Tab-separated table of C-alpha atoms in Angstrom:
chain	number	residue	atom	x	y	z
A	1	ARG	CA	-21.013	-41.096	11.545
A	2	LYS	CA	-20.375	-37.440	12.571
A	3	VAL	CA	-21.795	-35.869	9.350
A	4	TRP	CA	-25.372	-37.075	10.133
A	5	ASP	CA	-25.617	-34.749	13.233
A	6	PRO	CA	-24.871	-31.050	11.928
A	7	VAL	CA	-28.387	-30.576	10.443
A	8	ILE	CA	-29.859	-31.141	13.926
A	9	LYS	CA	-26.892	-29.302	15.562
A	10	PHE	CA	-27.374	-26.159	13.420
A	11	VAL	CA	-31.179	-26.237	14.007
A	12	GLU	CA	-30.626	-26.555	17.811
A	13	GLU	CA	-28.168	-23.644	17.553
A	14	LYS	CA	-30.939	-21.645	15.894
A	15	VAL	CA	-33.443	-22.322	18.728
A	16	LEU	CA	-31.291	-22.071	21.914
A	17	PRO	CA	-29.177	-18.915	21.063
A	18	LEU	CA	-32.293	-17.096	19.649
A	19	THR	CA	-34.215	-17.786	22.876
A	20	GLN	CA	-31.196	-16.551	24.926
A	21	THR	CA	-29.008	1.785	20.699
A	22	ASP	CA	-25.655	3.572	21.077
A	23	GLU	CA	-26.554	5.182	24.406
A	24	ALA	CA	-28.232	2.107	25.950
A	25	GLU	CA	-25.177	-0.072	25.194
A	26	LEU	CA	-23.080	2.142	27.457
A	27	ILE	CA	-25.940	2.474	29.968
A	28	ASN	CA	-26.411	-1.267	30.471
A	29	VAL	CA	-22.656	-1.921	30.552
A	30	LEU	CA	-22.335	0.791	33.228
A	31	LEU	CA	-25.177	-0.818	35.207
A	32	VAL	CA	-23.327	-4.162	35.313
A	33	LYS	CA	-20.368	-2.367	36.972
A	34	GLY	CA	-22.427	-2.012	40.188
A	35	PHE	CA	-21.529	-5.646	40.989
A	36	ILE	CA	-24.135	-27.370	27.131
A	37	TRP	CA	-24.673	-30.689	25.274
A	38	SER	CA	-24.746	-28.670	22.015
A	39	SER	CA	-21.173	-27.501	22.671
A	40	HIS	CA	-20.089	-31.107	23.233
A	41	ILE	CA	-21.632	-32.202	19.904
A	42	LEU	CA	-19.664	-29.488	18.125
A	43	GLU	CA	-16.523	-30.201	20.226
A	44	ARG	CA	-16.581	-33.901	19.250
A	45	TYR	CA	-16.897	-33.112	15.509
A	46	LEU	CA	-14.232	-30.335	15.601
A	47	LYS	CA	-11.537	-32.859	16.639
A	48	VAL	CA	-11.536	-34.036	13.008
A	49	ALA	CA	-13.719	-31.525	11.083
A	50	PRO	CA	-12.425	-30.023	7.769
A	51	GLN	CA	-13.115	-26.246	7.766
A	52	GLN	CA	-13.838	-22.990	9.631
A	53	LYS	CA	-17.429	-22.814	8.205
A	54	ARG	CA	-18.198	-25.414	10.892
A	55	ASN	CA	-16.208	-23.441	13.543
A	56	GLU	CA	-18.375	-20.331	12.834
A	57	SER	CA	-21.421	-22.261	14.171
A	58	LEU	CA	-19.618	-23.333	17.398
A	59	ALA	CA	-18.955	-19.650	18.227
A	60	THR	CA	-22.764	-18.993	18.348
A	61	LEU	CA	-23.170	-20.862	21.652
A	62	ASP	CA	-20.436	-22.621	26.457
A	63	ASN	CA	-17.478	-20.310	27.023
A	64	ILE	CA	-15.082	-22.779	28.726
A	65	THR	CA	-15.588	-25.265	25.847
A	66	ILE	CA	-15.194	-22.503	23.234
A	67	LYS	CA	-11.951	-21.397	24.947
A	68	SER	CA	-10.715	-25.011	25.366
A	69	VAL	CA	-10.971	-25.951	21.669
A	70	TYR	CA	-9.726	-22.576	20.238
A	71	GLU	CA	-6.568	-22.992	22.393
A	72	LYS	CA	-5.566	-25.713	19.836
A	73	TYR	CA	-5.931	-23.190	16.960
A	74	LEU	CA	-3.984	-20.319	18.627
A	75	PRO	CA	-0.134	-20.440	18.490
A	76	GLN	CA	1.874	-20.586	21.734
A	77	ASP	CA	4.301	-17.920	22.959
A	78	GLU	CA	8.016	-18.941	22.919
A	79	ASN	CA	8.450	-18.824	26.724
A	80	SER	CA	5.095	-17.947	28.380
A	81	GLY	CA	2.949	-20.454	26.401
A	82	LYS	CA	0.287	-17.707	26.065
A	83	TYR	CA	-2.315	-18.187	23.304
A	84	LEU	CA	-1.347	-15.704	20.505
A	85	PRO	CA	-3.705	-14.811	17.619
A	86	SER	CA	-2.977	-16.067	14.094
A	87	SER	CA	-3.486	-14.961	10.484
A	88	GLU	CA	-4.413	-18.575	9.659
A	89	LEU	CA	-7.664	-17.828	11.486
A	90	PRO	CA	-9.997	-15.151	10.072
A	91	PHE	CA	-10.611	-11.981	12.116
A	92	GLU	CA	-14.179	-12.759	13.254
A	93	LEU	CA	-13.111	-15.999	14.980
A	94	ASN	CA	-10.241	-14.179	16.743
A	95	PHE	CA	-12.840	-11.700	18.038
A	96	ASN	CA	-15.008	-14.650	19.180
A	97	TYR	CA	-12.089	-16.096	21.197
A	98	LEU	CA	-11.422	-12.619	22.620
A	99	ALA	CA	-15.101	-12.455	23.664
A	100	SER	CA	-14.717	-15.923	25.241
A	101	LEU	CA	-11.892	-14.697	27.485
A	102	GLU	CA	-13.925	-11.564	28.239
A	103	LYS	CA	-17.034	-13.527	29.211
A	104	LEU	CA	-15.054	-15.805	31.519
A	105	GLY	CA	-13.448	-12.785	33.232
A	106	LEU	CA	-9.933	-14.208	32.677
A	107	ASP	CA	-8.627	-10.675	32.977
A	108	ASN	CA	-4.846	-10.929	32.543
A	109	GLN	CA	-5.242	-13.439	29.698
A	110	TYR	CA	-7.786	-11.139	28.025
A	111	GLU	CA	-5.603	-8.031	28.184
A	112	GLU	CA	-2.541	-10.045	27.093
A	113	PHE	CA	-4.567	-11.199	24.092
A	114	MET	CA	-5.661	-7.603	23.355
A	115	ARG	CA	-2.028	-6.325	23.328
A	116	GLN	CA	-1.291	-8.795	20.533
A	117	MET	CA	-4.670	-8.393	18.787
A	118	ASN	CA	-4.114	-4.643	18.510
A	119	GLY	CA	-0.500	-5.390	17.497
A	120	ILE	CA	-1.361	-7.685	14.562
A	121	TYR	CA	-4.190	-5.457	13.261
A	122	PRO	CA	-4.143	-2.070	11.594
A	123	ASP	CA	-7.505	-1.029	9.907
A	124	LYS	CA	-9.445	-2.698	12.828
A	125	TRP	CA	-7.977	0.043	15.099
A	126	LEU	CA	-11.430	1.511	15.881
A	127	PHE	CA	-13.303	-1.756	16.559
A	128	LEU	CA	-10.909	-3.141	19.190
A	129	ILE	CA	-10.369	0.243	20.954
A	130	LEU	CA	-14.132	0.656	21.438
A	131	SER	CA	-14.412	-2.995	22.577
A	132	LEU	CA	-11.462	-2.549	25.017
A	133	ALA	CA	-13.351	0.504	26.290
A	134	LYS	CA	-16.283	-1.885	26.864
A	135	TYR	CA	-13.975	-4.165	28.897
A	136	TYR	CA	-13.053	-1.230	31.100
A	137	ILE	CA	-16.676	0.034	31.306
A	138	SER	CA	-18.137	-3.338	32.328
A	139	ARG	CA	-15.503	-3.838	35.028
A	140	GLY	CA	-14.731	-1.431	37.889
A	141	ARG	CA	-11.857	0.282	36.047
A	142	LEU	CA	-13.711	3.521	35.233
A	143	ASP	CA	-10.475	5.593	35.344
A	144	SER	CA	-8.779	3.624	32.551
A	145	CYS	CA	-11.806	4.080	30.284
A	146	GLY	CA	-11.267	7.832	30.258
A	147	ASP	CA	-7.492	7.394	30.020
A	148	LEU	CA	-7.868	4.945	27.092
A	149	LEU	CA	-10.207	7.192	25.134
A	150	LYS	CA	-8.091	10.303	25.835
A	151	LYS	CA	-4.821	8.606	24.818
A	152	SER	CA	-6.580	7.315	21.668
A	153	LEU	CA	-8.563	10.450	20.743
A	154	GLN	CA	-5.273	12.248	20.095
A	155	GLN	CA	-4.229	9.532	17.576
A	156	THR	CA	-6.975	9.857	14.915
A	157	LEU	CA	-5.844	10.564	11.340
A	158	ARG	CA	-9.350	10.739	9.818
A	159	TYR	CA	-12.628	12.482	10.550
A	160	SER	CA	-15.117	9.547	10.479
A	161	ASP	CA	-13.054	7.486	12.946
A	162	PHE	CA	-12.597	10.582	15.128
A	163	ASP	CA	-16.373	11.041	15.128
A	164	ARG	CA	-16.822	7.432	16.311
A	165	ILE	CA	-14.462	7.815	19.301
A	166	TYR	CA	-15.680	11.373	20.059
A	167	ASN	CA	-19.439	10.672	20.132
A	168	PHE	CA	-18.757	7.525	22.182
A	169	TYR	CA	-16.740	9.490	24.771
A	170	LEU	CA	-19.515	12.121	24.868
A	171	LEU	CA	-22.232	9.516	25.519
A	172	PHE	CA	-20.023	7.779	28.096
A	173	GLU	CA	-19.500	10.860	30.228
A	174	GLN	CA	-23.160	11.931	29.950
A	175	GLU	CA	-24.495	8.544	31.017
A	176	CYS	CA	-21.895	8.064	33.777
A	177	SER	CA	-22.741	11.429	35.349
A	178	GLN	CA	-26.457	10.678	34.962
A	179	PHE	CA	-25.988	7.269	36.628
A	180	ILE	CA	-23.995	8.494	39.613
A	181	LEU	CA	-26.357	11.470	40.197
A	182	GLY	CA	-29.144	8.929	40.710
A	183	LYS	CA	-27.009	6.967	43.193
A	184	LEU	CA	-27.434	9.773	45.758
A	185	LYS	CA	-31.264	9.181	45.724
A	186	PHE	CA	-21.541	10.092	54.234
A	187	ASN	CA	-18.096	9.343	52.729
A	188	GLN	CA	-19.456	7.277	49.808
A	189	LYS	CA	-21.973	10.043	49.124
A	190	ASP	CA	-19.174	12.645	49.221
A	191	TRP	CA	-17.421	10.447	46.642
A	192	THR	CA	-20.569	10.445	44.500
A	193	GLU	CA	-20.638	14.277	44.602
A	194	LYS	CA	-16.913	14.494	43.767
A	195	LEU	CA	-17.149	12.137	40.802
A	196	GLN	CA	-20.386	13.780	39.593
A	197	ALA	CA	-18.357	16.986	39.427
A	198	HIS	CA	-15.457	15.167	37.721
A	199	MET	CA	-17.530	13.644	34.914
A	200	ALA	CA	-19.532	16.892	34.628
A	201	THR	CA	-16.188	18.683	34.084
A	202	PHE	CA	-14.777	16.010	31.792
A	203	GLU	CA	-17.799	17.385	29.873
A	204	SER	CA	-15.233	20.061	28.786
A	205	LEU	CA	-15.371	18.045	25.497
A	206	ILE	CA	-18.332	20.305	24.593
A	207	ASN	CA	-16.123	23.377	25.061
A	208	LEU	CA	-13.004	22.180	23.223
A	209	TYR	CA	-14.832	20.743	20.158
A	210	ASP	CA	-13.350	22.940	17.395
A	211	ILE	CA	-9.812	22.638	18.800
A	212	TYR	CA	-9.965	18.822	18.517
A	213	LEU	CA	-11.776	19.031	15.137
A	214	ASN	CA	-8.881	21.026	13.677
A	215	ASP	CA	-6.175	19.084	15.582
A	216	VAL	CA	-7.334	16.127	13.451
A	217	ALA	CA	-6.450	18.180	10.347
A	218	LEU	CA	-3.127	19.177	11.950
A	219	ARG	CA	-2.441	15.442	12.177
A	220	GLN	CA	-3.342	14.824	8.528
A	221	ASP	CA	-1.602	17.817	6.993
A	222	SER	CA	0.615	19.495	9.678
A	223	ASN	CA	2.233	21.932	7.189
A	224	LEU	CA	-0.932	23.337	5.566
A	225	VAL	CA	-1.058	26.935	6.835
A	226	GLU	CA	-4.795	27.697	6.452
A	227	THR	CA	-5.707	25.177	9.175
A	228	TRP	CA	-3.116	26.776	11.483
A	229	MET	CA	-4.844	30.088	10.826
A	230	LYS	CA	-8.194	28.428	11.564
A	231	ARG	CA	-6.586	27.206	14.834
A	232	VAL	CA	-5.786	30.923	15.459
A	233	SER	CA	-9.399	32.024	14.742
A	234	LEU	CA	-10.710	29.694	17.502
A	235	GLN	CA	-8.656	31.051	20.429
A	236	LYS	CA	-10.474	33.315	22.883
A	237	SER	CA	-8.760	36.625	21.750
A	238	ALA	CA	-6.878	37.184	25.027
A	239	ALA	CA	-3.166	37.179	23.871
A	240	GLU	CA	-3.582	33.379	23.642
A	241	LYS	CA	-2.852	33.774	19.887
A	242	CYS	CA	0.878	34.178	20.699
A	243	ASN	CA	0.910	30.535	21.914
A	244	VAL	CA	-0.634	29.192	18.676
A	245	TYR	CA	1.598	31.263	16.326
A	246	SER	CA	4.651	30.236	18.414
A	247	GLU	CA	3.789	26.575	17.963
B	1	UNK	CA	-12.530	-38.122	6.953
B	2	UNK	CA	-9.399	-37.774	9.090
B	3	UNK	CA	-10.426	-40.799	11.237
B	4	UNK	CA	-8.380	-39.584	14.222
B	5	UNK	CA	-11.273	-40.429	16.563
B	6	UNK	CA	-10.078	-44.081	16.829
B	7	UNK	CA	-10.296	-45.601	20.345
B	8	UNK	CA	-12.053	-42.556	21.830
B	9	UNK	CA	-15.561	-41.217	22.463
B	10	UNK	CA	-17.513	-38.046	23.239
B	11	UNK	CA	-17.423	-36.726	26.810
B	12	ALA	CA	-22.887	-34.238	33.461
B	13	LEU	CA	-24.205	-30.669	33.249
B	14	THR	CA	-25.139	-31.477	29.649
C	1	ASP	CA	-26.973	21.122	45.037
C	2	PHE	CA	-28.794	18.263	43.308
C	3	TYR	CA	-31.423	20.375	41.508
C	4	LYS	CA	-28.936	22.795	39.920
C	5	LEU	CA	-26.566	19.923	39.065
C	6	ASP	CA	-29.428	18.031	37.403
C	7	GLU	CA	-30.454	21.110	35.395
C	8	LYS	CA	-26.824	21.632	34.339
C	9	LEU	CA	-26.652	17.983	33.263
C	10	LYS	CA	-29.861	18.382	31.236
C	11	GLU	CA	-28.635	21.501	29.413
C	12	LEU	CA	-25.246	19.848	28.851
C	13	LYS	CA	-27.064	16.807	27.446
C	14	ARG	CA	-28.902	19.036	24.961
C	15	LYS	CA	-25.576	20.644	23.984
C	16	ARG	CA	-24.121	17.142	23.691
C	17	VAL	CA	-26.932	16.167	21.302
C	18	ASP	CA	-26.179	19.276	19.207
C	19	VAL	CA	-22.404	18.687	19.058
C	20	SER	CA	-22.780	15.010	18.210
C	21	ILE	CA	-25.267	15.932	15.459
C	22	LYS	CA	-22.699	18.309	13.935
C	23	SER	CA	-19.890	15.749	14.323
C	24	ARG	CA	-22.008	13.113	12.558
C	25	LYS	CA	-22.481	15.492	9.628
C	26	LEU	CA	-18.726	16.165	9.426
C	27	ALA	CA	-18.086	12.399	9.407
C	28	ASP	CA	-20.733	11.920	6.725
C	29	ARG	CA	-18.893	14.376	4.485
C	30	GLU	CA	-15.606	12.651	5.406
C	31	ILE	CA	-16.954	9.318	4.209
C	32	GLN	CA	-18.521	10.976	1.157
C	33	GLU	CA	-15.168	12.403	0.010
C	34	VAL	CA	-13.604	8.918	-0.186
C	35	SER	CA	-16.709	7.401	-1.876
C	36	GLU	CA	-6.297	45.903	-20.809
C	37	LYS	CA	-4.577	43.664	-18.324
C	38	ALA	CA	-1.897	43.570	-21.099
C	39	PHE	CA	-0.470	46.882	-19.807
C	40	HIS	CA	0.778	45.220	-16.551
C	41	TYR	CA	2.927	42.311	-17.758
C	42	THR	CA	6.668	42.803	-17.378
C	43	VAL	CA	9.081	42.606	-20.294
C	44	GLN	CA	10.081	39.240	-18.742
C	45	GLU	CA	6.475	38.044	-18.942
C	46	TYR	CA	6.218	39.410	-22.513
C	47	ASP	CA	9.346	37.858	-24.058
C	48	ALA	CA	8.404	34.369	-22.876
C	49	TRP	CA	4.915	34.672	-24.452
C	50	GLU	CA	6.579	34.908	-27.910
C	51	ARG	CA	7.081	31.128	-27.716
C	52	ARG	CA	3.415	30.269	-27.161
C	53	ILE	CA	12.632	18.215	-37.718
C	54	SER	CA	16.022	16.838	-38.766
C	55	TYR	CA	17.815	13.932	-37.092
C	56	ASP	CA	20.628	16.240	-35.906
C	57	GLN	CA	18.246	18.526	-34.013
C	58	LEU	CA	16.257	15.563	-32.657
C	59	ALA	CA	19.528	14.052	-31.400
C	60	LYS	CA	20.424	17.343	-29.678
C	61	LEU	CA	16.965	17.506	-28.063
C	62	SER	CA	17.270	13.885	-26.891
C	63	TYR	CA	20.664	14.663	-25.345
C	64	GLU	CA	19.190	17.709	-23.565
C	65	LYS	CA	16.228	15.693	-22.261
C	66	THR	CA	18.447	12.884	-20.962
C	67	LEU	CA	20.604	15.490	-19.202
C	68	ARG	CA	17.473	16.911	-17.551
C	69	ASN	CA	16.469	13.410	-16.394
C	70	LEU	CA	20.027	12.770	-15.172
C	71	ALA	CA	20.012	16.020	-13.204
C	72	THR	CA	16.645	15.425	-11.479
C	73	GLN	CA	17.924	12.343	-9.611
C	74	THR	CA	20.838	14.258	-8.030
C	75	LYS	CA	40.697	6.520	-12.663
C	76	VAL	CA	42.264	5.069	-15.846
C	77	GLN	CA	45.206	2.708	-16.475
C	78	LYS	CA	46.650	0.860	-19.447
C	79	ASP	CA	47.611	-2.788	-18.940
C	80	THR	CA	51.152	-3.185	-20.361
C	81	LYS	CA	50.713	-6.959	-20.851
C	82	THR	CA	47.667	-6.452	-23.139
C	83	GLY	CA	47.931	-2.799	-24.255
C	84	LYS	CA	44.314	-2.319	-23.178
C	85	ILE	CA	42.703	0.552	-21.229
C	86	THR	CA	40.980	-0.152	-17.883
C	87	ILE	CA	38.205	1.946	-16.300
C	88	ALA	CA	37.609	2.079	-12.524
C	89	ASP	CA	33.960	3.153	-12.715
C	90	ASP	CA	31.392	2.712	-9.947
C	91	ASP	CA	29.111	-0.344	-10.118
C	92	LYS	CA	26.189	1.725	-8.751
C	93	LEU	CA	26.266	4.073	-11.741
C	94	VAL	CA	26.745	1.192	-14.227
C	95	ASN	CA	23.746	-0.624	-12.743
C	96	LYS	CA	21.707	2.600	-12.670
C	97	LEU	CA	22.486	3.293	-16.346
C	98	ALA	CA	21.360	-0.234	-17.273
C	99	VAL	CA	18.184	0.141	-15.174
C	100	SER	CA	17.459	3.561	-16.719
C	101	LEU	CA	17.764	2.177	-20.254
C	102	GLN	CA	15.536	-0.805	-19.381
C	103	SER	CA	12.870	1.340	-17.719
C	104	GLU	CA	12.833	3.991	-20.457
C	105	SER	CA	12.558	1.210	-23.067
C	106	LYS	CA	9.602	-0.196	-21.122
C	107	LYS	CA	7.951	3.245	-20.908
C	108	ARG	CA	8.367	3.940	-24.653
C	109	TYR	CA	7.165	0.416	-25.512
C	110	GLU	CA	4.069	0.638	-23.314
C	111	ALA	CA	3.178	4.161	-24.492
C	112	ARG	CA	3.285	2.938	-28.100
C	113	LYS	CA	1.109	-0.027	-27.011
C	114	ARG	CA	-1.452	2.386	-25.514
C	115	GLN	CA	-1.469	4.295	-28.802
C	116	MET	CA	-1.992	1.002	-30.688
C	117	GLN	CA	-4.894	0.078	-28.417
C	118	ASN	CA	-6.856	3.229	-29.298
C	119	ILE	CA	-11.889	-5.615	-42.571
C	120	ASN	CA	-8.491	-6.524	-41.093
C	121	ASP	CA	-5.852	-4.889	-38.853
C	122	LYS	CA	-3.529	-4.092	-41.808
C	123	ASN	CA	-6.463	-2.880	-43.982
C	124	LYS	CA	-7.633	-0.402	-41.287
C	125	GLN	CA	-3.980	0.719	-40.769
C	126	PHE	CA	-3.841	1.393	-44.546
C	127	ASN	CA	-7.137	3.338	-44.378
C	128	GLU	CA	-5.775	5.372	-41.412
C	129	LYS	CA	-2.591	6.067	-43.422
C	130	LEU	CA	-4.824	7.288	-46.297
C	131	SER	CA	-6.687	9.527	-43.803
C	132	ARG	CA	-3.321	10.958	-42.680
C	133	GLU	CA	-2.430	11.462	-46.372
C	134	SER	CA	-5.521	13.641	-46.878
D	1	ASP	CA	5.156	-23.882	-22.453
D	2	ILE	CA	8.681	-25.165	-21.802
D	3	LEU	CA	9.499	-27.439	-18.852
D	4	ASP	CA	12.986	-28.765	-19.655
D	5	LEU	CA	16.335	-27.661	-21.107
D	6	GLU	CA	15.974	-30.133	-23.998
D	7	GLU	CA	12.605	-28.529	-24.775
D	8	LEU	CA	14.312	-25.118	-24.710
D	9	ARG	CA	16.847	-26.463	-27.222
D	10	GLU	CA	13.997	-27.631	-29.493
D	11	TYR	CA	12.311	-24.206	-29.251
D	12	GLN	CA	15.592	-22.411	-29.931
D	13	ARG	CA	16.325	-24.642	-32.951
D	14	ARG	CA	12.905	-23.904	-34.476
D	15	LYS	CA	13.114	-20.131	-33.941
D	16	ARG	CA	16.739	-19.894	-35.101
D	17	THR	CA	15.883	-21.897	-38.236
D	18	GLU	CA	12.964	-19.529	-38.923
D	19	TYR	CA	14.984	-16.314	-38.474
D	20	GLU	CA	18.020	-17.619	-40.381
D	21	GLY	CA	15.845	-18.792	-43.271
D	22	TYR	CA	14.208	-15.388	-43.632
D	23	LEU	CA	17.523	-13.545	-43.349
D	24	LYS	CA	18.987	-15.915	-45.919
D	25	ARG	CA	16.125	-15.208	-48.336
D	26	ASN	CA	16.159	-11.443	-47.647
D	27	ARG	CA	19.152	-10.078	-45.719
D	28	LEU	CA	18.270	-6.394	-46.198
D	29	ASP	CA	15.323	-6.422	-43.725
D	30	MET	CA	17.172	-4.715	-40.868
D	31	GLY	CA	14.199	-4.972	-38.505
D	32	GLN	CA	14.213	-8.744	-38.928
D	33	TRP	CA	17.932	-8.749	-37.983
D	34	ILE	CA	17.183	-6.591	-34.932
D	35	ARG	CA	14.420	-8.823	-33.616
D	36	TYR	CA	16.534	-11.976	-34.198
D	37	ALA	CA	19.243	-10.369	-32.047
D	38	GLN	CA	16.526	-9.489	-29.509
D	39	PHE	CA	15.450	-13.158	-29.506
D	40	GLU	CA	18.990	-14.227	-28.638
D	41	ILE	CA	19.179	-11.617	-25.878
D	42	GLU	CA	15.978	-13.187	-24.504
D	43	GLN	CA	17.864	-16.519	-24.471
D	44	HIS	CA	20.642	-14.796	-22.399
D	45	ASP	CA	23.213	-15.954	-25.016
D	46	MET	CA	25.172	-12.757	-25.535
D	47	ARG	CA	27.733	-14.400	-27.862
D	48	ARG	CA	24.989	-15.243	-30.374
D	49	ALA	CA	23.393	-11.795	-29.932
D	50	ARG	CA	26.713	-10.028	-30.546
D	51	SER	CA	27.353	-12.228	-33.608
D	52	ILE	CA	23.933	-11.373	-35.077
D	53	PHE	CA	24.471	-7.641	-34.546
D	54	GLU	CA	27.912	-7.903	-36.175
D	55	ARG	CA	26.504	-9.752	-39.203
D	56	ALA	CA	23.724	-7.166	-39.468
D	57	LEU	CA	26.350	-4.401	-39.446
D	58	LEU	CA	28.207	-6.237	-42.203
D	59	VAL	CA	25.021	-6.189	-44.284
D	60	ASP	CA	24.606	-2.432	-43.675
D	61	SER	CA	26.984	-0.402	-41.495
D	62	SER	CA	25.241	2.912	-42.259
D	63	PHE	CA	21.933	2.144	-40.519
D	64	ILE	CA	21.895	4.133	-37.246
D	65	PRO	CA	19.019	2.271	-35.341
D	66	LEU	CA	21.040	-0.953	-35.629
D	67	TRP	CA	24.064	0.717	-34.008
D	68	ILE	CA	21.888	2.216	-31.246
D	69	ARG	CA	20.215	-1.169	-30.598
D	70	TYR	CA	23.579	-2.947	-30.309
D	71	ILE	CA	25.013	-0.266	-27.965
D	72	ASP	CA	21.885	-0.215	-25.798
D	73	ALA	CA	21.841	-4.035	-25.723
D	74	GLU	CA	25.410	-4.073	-24.404
D	75	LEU	CA	24.623	-1.429	-21.798
D	76	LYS	CA	21.373	-3.129	-20.643
D	77	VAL	CA	23.381	-6.190	-19.560
D	78	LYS	CA	26.030	-4.019	-17.754
D	79	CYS	CA	28.717	-4.775	-20.384
D	80	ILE	CA	30.111	-1.272	-20.251
D	81	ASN	CA	33.567	-1.890	-21.750
D	82	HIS	CA	32.088	-3.818	-24.696
D	83	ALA	CA	29.806	-0.811	-25.173
D	84	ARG	CA	32.820	1.537	-24.983
D	85	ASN	CA	34.687	-0.367	-27.721
D	86	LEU	CA	31.490	-0.463	-29.772
D	87	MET	CA	30.716	3.263	-29.455
D	88	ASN	CA	34.306	4.212	-30.260
D	89	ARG	CA	34.038	2.045	-33.384
D	90	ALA	CA	30.645	3.621	-34.188
D	91	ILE	CA	31.946	7.177	-34.149
D	92	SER	CA	35.124	5.988	-35.918
D	93	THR	CA	33.144	4.714	-38.946
D	94	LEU	CA	30.417	7.419	-38.907
D	95	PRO	CA	32.006	10.581	-37.386
D	96	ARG	CA	29.506	12.985	-38.941
D	97	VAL	CA	26.380	11.456	-37.349
D	98	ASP	CA	25.585	13.525	-34.243
D	99	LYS	CA	23.474	10.782	-32.619
D	100	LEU	CA	26.401	8.378	-32.115
D	101	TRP	CA	28.547	11.108	-30.532
D	102	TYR	CA	25.693	12.071	-28.205
D	103	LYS	CA	25.084	8.406	-27.297
């Protein structure tokens, strides 16, 4: 009796979710910082359904129901009862549950999930760090965005993944300064001027480019002398070279 | 095919 | 303040576009990678350049080679009641000798297989033997 | 292939009958002797393996690869003192062969 419904359920999922860019993604997320029957069809079937190819379609819808069923597919913690991620689930569904907690604003539960979801996953080290940056961007925690990206930029063992975090951080600071300049269009306005200056001086990333670019190589191959000599060539010829050779 | 839905039914804003 | 700050932000944005463009190219390459002198040789350098079988000599060479391999990786009593010698040797070295013999046998065996893999199998082996004869 | 000990016994009977028939009909094929001994080492029955090597030596004691195979077979299974007795015997019968001394 359940198996007659998914043809209509999948077609409804096509219509209702369809009816519902690097710079603009940060811009819109920054702008936000200024602040159902279909689910029940899928929820009824998923009590007894056989596979995750069904569960994929549920995740397209909502959020309290999506949370409430996935809780039965996430292992408990030994003493907290927290919903841990599993390797029995595939990675995309774990990210869907993560997005469920993010959409509901269940902040402590979200970050507790992220601690584990970073912990269980090498290789996906970029994708979650950028998305955690989105969690900090969308919310009011602008400080921790910079602190996250800084404490993760000095952890990159490869050039492509460095370029991903570096261009993101660049766009972030540009758009943030651009946004808060427009806000002035007097204590709050003093704060706007101060933080304009701060983001416009966290723009030091344009100055220090070649130092970071070679520090990546010093993380790959720390005892390869020619890239220490390149890191001498880039100092500003003011007896600074003593510091580099010393190190 | 699990048939665990015995003696229960589907659950309004819907 | 606002006009100069805005102009600074615009120039910095242009510089940001430039730097990101360069960084993108570096990352693209990063992904793409993973996708009459005779009169000055010493006598030392000259005597070495002079360089460039029986079972007894082959046995000596095998002994030398095994000693090389052995080098790269780095009590006695007689029982009166049996008359037999006892050796107090270390189990680690016994096990390592057994493992070395097994692994070298595997390496020899597989190398000969790789050589083998390069009208009938025996008939072509006979024709190859005749080509070696010539 | 083989699911049961009784089936292993059947397999071992067939192979042993094969090898023993060929070595009965032609004992001087030393390679056949060697691979029969190798078969018994694969069965983990070192008593049979040792017996086959000893019989092979009785057919021809002068053949150096047979000695080296027996010594290496003893060493591969960590039977060092058996190997020591065997090597001492090997040099004692063939003192002028450098390979046994080096082994």
